[PDB]
From a paper:
A key colistin resistance mechanism is the production of MCR-1, a plasmid-encoded phosphoethanolamine transferase that has disseminated worldwide. MCR-1 catalyses the transfer of positively charged phosphoethanolamine onto lipid A, which is subsequently incorporated into the outer membrane, reducing the net negative charge and preventing colistin binding. It is an integral, metal-dependent inner-membrane protein, with a large periplasmic domain containing the catalytic centre and the conserved Thr285 that is likely to act as the acceptor for the phosphoethanolamine group during the transfer reaction.
To understand MCR diversity, we have solved the crystal structure of the MCR-2 catalytic domain (residues 217–538; MCR-2CD), which is 87% identical to MCR-1CD. As for Zn1 in MCR-1, Zn1 in MCR-2 is coordinated by Glu246, Thr285 and Asp465 (all with a coordination distance of 1.92 Å) and His466 (2.04 Å) in a tetrahedral geometry. Although the Zn1 coordination distances are shorter in MCR-2 compared with MCR-1, there are no other structural differences around the Zn1 site, further underlying the importance of Zn1 to enzyme function. Solvent-accessible loops are largely unperturbed, although loop 411–424 shifts ∼4 Å between MCR-15GRR and MCR-2CD. This residue is sterically strained by forming a hydrogen bond to Asn329, and is also a Ramachadran plot outlier in all other MCR-1 structures. The MCR-2CD structure also indicates that amino-acid mutations on the periplasmic facing surface of MCR-1 are well tolerated. The physiological relevance of the second zinc site has yet to be established, although it has now been observed in three MCR crystal structures. Resolving this issue will require accurate and detailed mechanistic and computational studies of phosphoethanolamine transfer by the MCR family of enzymes, the latter of which will be greatly facilitated by the exceptionally high resolution of the current structure.
Residue numbers in the entry: 217 to 540
The structure:
């Protein structure tokens, strides 16, 4: 049958013709655990750069829709919520990006992870780019693995802003982040702060502290990427109200009870695979975060993205969001 719509009643209550246009980067994070962020109680400073950003909000009580990228990513952009979510048919539902595009918001998705897991499939091919290879990513030569880096997704974004100047814009950066098993490959060597590091692709053969250290070094690289994304947004704050939303797609098991990696069914998965960090920053009070300890899930993402662009829609109007 046809695409199943959920927000045909969506309306944008203020337009970029009547107020300052809005430019948002949504970092779609990867494999990051809430309990390895110092803001949430971790006894190591894994986010030192974000710790120094004025106006950076951290959300300490967020849990994911699921435990893998294929499962969680479509749910993050869904109208259905985790309880009604069906991974098999998510591709055939109107999602929040479809709504925003229909209402005139520019949508761009750069992917240094895998792909959009069906989220971008109805939208024009010109709105999605594979940043896992040097065909598009200019930052793949900073490490001996030739692995393309998340910071490469920021290069050239000014051309996109110029081509859509004066419109509202939402840019998804799907980062490699902390995906394993080979955490040691996920960061350039200026982030090799904690030692010893487990150097291999079979984590069950790692000594425990060396496994943690490799994982935490990868978090330092993500701290840096998010900080640089905020720096990029700041270069546009004269002409746009700017904001950055970060949410990880799921956590990671690090050997607790013999469990590694992620992907367990929600009915069985340990809390480590579900408790995820989330951050929000904006340049001014056009947006206001909700309380940092609000109990939230991935169901909060769709209403947040709508609120960022002053869009209302009946399907999610009583949902808690990351902003007021
Ligand atoms: Zn995975
Ligand atoms: Zn993932």
């Amino acid at each position: 049958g046809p695409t199943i719509y959920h927000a045909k009643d969506a309306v944008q209550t203020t337009k970029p013709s009547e107020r300052k246009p809005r430019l948002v980067v949504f970092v779609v994070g990867e494999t990051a655990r809430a309990d390895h962020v110092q803001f949430n109680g971790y006894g190591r400073e894994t986010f030192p750069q974000l710790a120094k950003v004025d106006g950076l909000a951290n959300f300490s009580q967020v849990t994911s829709c699921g435990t893998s990228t294929a499962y969680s990513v479509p749910c993050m952009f869904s109208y259905l919520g985790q309880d009604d979510y069906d991974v098999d048919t998510a591709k055939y539902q109107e999602n929040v990006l479809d709504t925003l595009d229909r209402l005139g918001v520019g949508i761009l998705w750069r992917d240094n992870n895998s792909d959009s897991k069906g989220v971008m499939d109805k939208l024009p091919a010109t709105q999605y780019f594979d940043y896992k290879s040097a065909t598009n990513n200019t930052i793949c030569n900073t490490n001996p693995y030739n692995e393309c880096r998340d910071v490469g997704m920021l290069v050239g974004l000014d051309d996109y802003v110029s081509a859509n100047n004066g419109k509202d814009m939402l840019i998804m950066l799907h980062q490699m982040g902390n995906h394993g098993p080979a955490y040691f490959k996920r960061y350039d060597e200026q982030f090799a702060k904690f030692t010893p590091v487990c150097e291999g692709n079979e984590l069950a053969k790692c000594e425990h502290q060396s496994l943690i250290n490799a994982y935490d070094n990868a978090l330092l690289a993500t701290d840096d990427f998010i900080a640089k994304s905020i720096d990029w947004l700041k270069t546009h704050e004269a002409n746009y109200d700017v904001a950055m939303l970060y949410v990880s797609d799921h956590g990671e098991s690090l050997g607790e009870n013999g469990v590694y990696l992620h992907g367990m069914p929600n009915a069985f998965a340990p809390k480590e695979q579900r408790a995820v960090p989330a951050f929000f920053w904006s340049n001014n009070t056009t947006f206001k975060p909700t309380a940092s300890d609000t109990v939230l899930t991935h169901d909060a993402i769709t209403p947040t993205l709508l609120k960022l662009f002053d869009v209302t829609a009946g399907k999610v109007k009583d949902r808690a969001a990351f902003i007021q």
